[PDB]
Design a binder for this molecule. Structure first.
Ligand code: HEM
Ligand code: HEM
Ligand SMILES: [Ca+2]
Ligand SMILES: [Ca+2]
Ligand code: NA
Ligand code: NA
Lengths: 309, 309
């Protein structure tokens, strides 16, 4: 289906101003991901990360923002892929060239690139509402701490957070499917291994995880989806059913009575998952967006447009 | 004379790496100032401003820093010239091209551009110690408030602040000579007019100032040096002797017994002023600098070099 459109946004927002905008972003992503498969996961996560930190307003792309491109102090689980930040900037440049001006916002680029990353990885092609404006407000560590969901959080905590932000249980289970591709550093799940193992981890999976992260503090990464690491599909839900979810936030989806039925549904039908994904990710991608007068269209995603006004 | 060199810095720091660096900066400034005379004042003040806020480390050039290029909330007296930020970036780009790589730091560019701005405005040609590194730390409003001297401050307060930062009374009187060029917004001196006029302002000058700023809150600017607004010379000291200094920080230099003799000396001999300027501005330009491992060489002055390390 198609996601509900928030006030101010619309599909084909650039139809008149820059009709080929979406094609340019896709063509760039296709080539970029071909050269670096992990870029797809990076871009997809970047969109998610940004959306939760203050809203889908490209705030985390700013150098002045916590977890932004110049961040070197944050732990592995809070540091985004450098190539993801770079890709967005490159796309922005290419778009300015194509549109004969800075018409497309970095916020929209994030939404489009994420969609294309999914498509390029074998996922569903869904429509993306456009018209978001870029924020001139930097994200503080406080913003990150209060709005960004952590991997150690259970479904109860996540439903509360997402509830405040306008997403329901279905959205939670659905957007969590983003973990069907990508990597995770030991630090993000080592607490499920030490001191004592999480009883929800299947014995076989535990042995595997202990090999990857022999002790707390191990500097190593592993795949989020043990079955198909780089293919966007429903295998992530099958992992959960088999007690092979990496994070507590992953596995608890199968443990919790409220989310369990949805997990089982998606595990049984990839089509059910794909159809719902475009809707739920569409809703996530419209959280607290800046419209028209609320933001600007950056000439460089890393910085706010210079000038007194 | 030549200013004392701080540990880590040296004249001709780029002699081997990029010998023509200094020539490129001058040539750019000469042309840029020709097109926009006010740019000289902008660059000169930018160097001063940056040096006091945390140290001569180009921190204020960062978009993430208070009073930086993206600042739109600060009052007129705390907003630097947009063209000054732009010029520095342009110089940095030209230098990367010339040096065949990002060799020269933005911090050094600030020091050189300031020197060239003085020279182009008819001032003395002095040697500049080089080798400063760019900071990865953003300046907070707190940093600005505690280290940046305000126009309402008297000599007693200024000597205390500068004393902590390694500058003496001579340095104060000398670097204050920077006000021999440039502009100031009514907000920076309106407190000397309303509610009751500052008795140190000569009657004639007061009438003039009241015309420029009829009431508190007037959005208008005036020249810092009523005699030669755009020429770098000792006329600023002559203004002080005639009770025609714009700021309290200006006029009090003549009022205070400690600084008065130096003001009178410079008013009588421009040569005495010019010779001392290169030394004092040299000292100011080396306050709390980052050397070798302490910073980086930005590929873009507005942002910290992206990456985990
Ligand atoms: C709301 C629950 C979520 C939590 C708690 C969460 C947490 C995390 C964490 C901690 C990492 C691993 C970082 C590391 O150790 O390197 C990660 C990676 C990832 N997440 Fe999520 N995530 C969630 C939702 C999402 C959503 C909505 C998407 C987007 C559809 C998404 C896409 C990804 C991707 C693709 C990666 C891999 C990134 C890469 O390989 O660079 N996540 N997530
Ligand atoms: C330490 C005492 C100083 C104080 C309190 C001070 C204060 C200020 C203030 C408030 C302005 C006016 C801003 C406005 O209203 O638009 C200004 C402008 C200026 N200052 Fe200073 N200043 C000082 C030292 C310096 C130094 C060391 C230099 C450099 C040699 C300098 C160079 C300038 C220049 C050229 C301008 C004009 C800038 C322009 O036209 O854009 N100042 N200063
Ligand atoms: Ca997969
Ligand atoms: Ca003058
Ligand atoms: Na954001
Ligand atoms: Na500074």
């Amino acid at each position: 289906a198609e996601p509900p459109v928030a006030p101010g946004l619309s599909f084909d927002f650039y139809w008149q101003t820059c009709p080929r905008a979406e094609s340019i972003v896709r063509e760039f992503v296709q080539e970029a991901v071909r050269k670096d498969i992990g870029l797809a996961a990076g871009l997809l996560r970047l969109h998610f990360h940004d959306c939760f930190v203050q809203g889908c307003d490209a705030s985390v792309l700013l150098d002045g923002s916590a977890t932004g491109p110049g961040e070197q102090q944050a732990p592995p689980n809070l540091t985004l892929r450098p190539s993801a930040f770079k890709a967005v900037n490159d796309i922005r440049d290419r778009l300015e060239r194509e549109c004969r001006g800075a018409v497309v916002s970095c916020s929209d680029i994030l939404a489009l690139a994420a969609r294309d990353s999914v498509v390029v990885s074998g996922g569903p092609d869904y429509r993306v509402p456009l018209g978001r404006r870029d924020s001139r407000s930097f994200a503080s560590t406080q913003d990150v701490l209060s709005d960004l969901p952590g991997p150690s959080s259970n479904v109860q905590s996540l439903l509360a957070l997402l509830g405040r932000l306008g997403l329901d249980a279905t959205d939670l289970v659905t957007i969590s499917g983003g973990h069907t591709i990508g990597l995770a550093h030991c630090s993000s799940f080592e607490d499920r291994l030490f001191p004592r193992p999480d009883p929800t981890i299947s014995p076989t999976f535990l042995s595997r995880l202990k090999r990857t992260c022999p002790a707390k503090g191990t500097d190593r990464r592993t795949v989020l989806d043990v079955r198909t690491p780089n293919v966007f599909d429903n295998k992530y839900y099958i992992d959960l059913v088999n007690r092979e979810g990496l994070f507590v936030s992953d596995q608890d989806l199968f443990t919790n009575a409220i989310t369990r039925p949805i997990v089982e549904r998606f595990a049984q039908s990839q089509q059910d998952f794909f159809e719902q994904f475009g809707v739920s990710i569409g809703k996530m991608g419209q959280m607290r967006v800046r419209t028209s007068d609320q933001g600007e269209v950056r000439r460089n995603c890393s910085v706010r447009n210079p000038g007194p006004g």
